[PDB]
Design a protein around this ligand. Sequence first.
Ligand SMILES: [Fe+3]
Length: 283
Amino acid sequence: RRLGVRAWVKENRGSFQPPVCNKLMHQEQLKVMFIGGPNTRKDYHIEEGEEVFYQLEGDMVLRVLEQGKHRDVVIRQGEIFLLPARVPHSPQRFANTVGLVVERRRLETELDGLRYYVGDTMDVLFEKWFYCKDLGTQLAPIIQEFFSSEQYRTGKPIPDQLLKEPPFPLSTRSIMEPMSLDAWLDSHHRELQAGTPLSLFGDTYETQVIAYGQGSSEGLRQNVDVWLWQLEGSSVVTMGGRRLSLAPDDSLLVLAGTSYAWERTQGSVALSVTQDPACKKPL
Ligand SMILES: [Fe+3]
């Protein structure tokens, strides 16, 4: 059950290049995925959940549509970034890179969308909305449909093929700056080692990426998965009758419906990632 994050990436190295570029480490309530490149594209993904990006190896560029403007969010190696819900985004990946993306299982009410725009404008050229179960697998025919369309050929939209409006309001939020994960952890060392766990992004988002220093935690049975990643030093997770020693870079998925006890050593640093849909921000 313990997975050394870079050890898992090395074992699955061949996944992080075309044609598929990705491999899901975890794929139940919490989608923990690792993505490579090269992969340059003009399609913009839109969803009701949030997406956490972290660059393990090399840099990536997340193109976003923010408050009526095109913006390129450069995510450098070691940088973490949280995308709020319903922001159109188009990830650009390069050869020999590895990025972590965390997202969640959709609620049965939730729609995902894929859009192509007319050149450098906000006018929609082609769009498809769907109920997401396996994102990569569902996007492939949509993209193939686009590349075989009159819209791609002419660069002109077919009005009858566009929705009158999106199924939900698109985000009105300002996008944060990506930040160095190690720099933020080091700058907050006194609070972390004083037994106070800290939210990296705060209460204005659904997702909770929490940093933990020394101390003891107890996780109650939840209908959401929790992913733990020991960054520095070690800790012990007691779960399902077993004591699991997390060494530097070890990660552990706590499946929905499982309780656990967590004992973190002095000087140790770990993260937990939760994307609970009950915490979705009102529209
Ligand atoms: Fe996305």
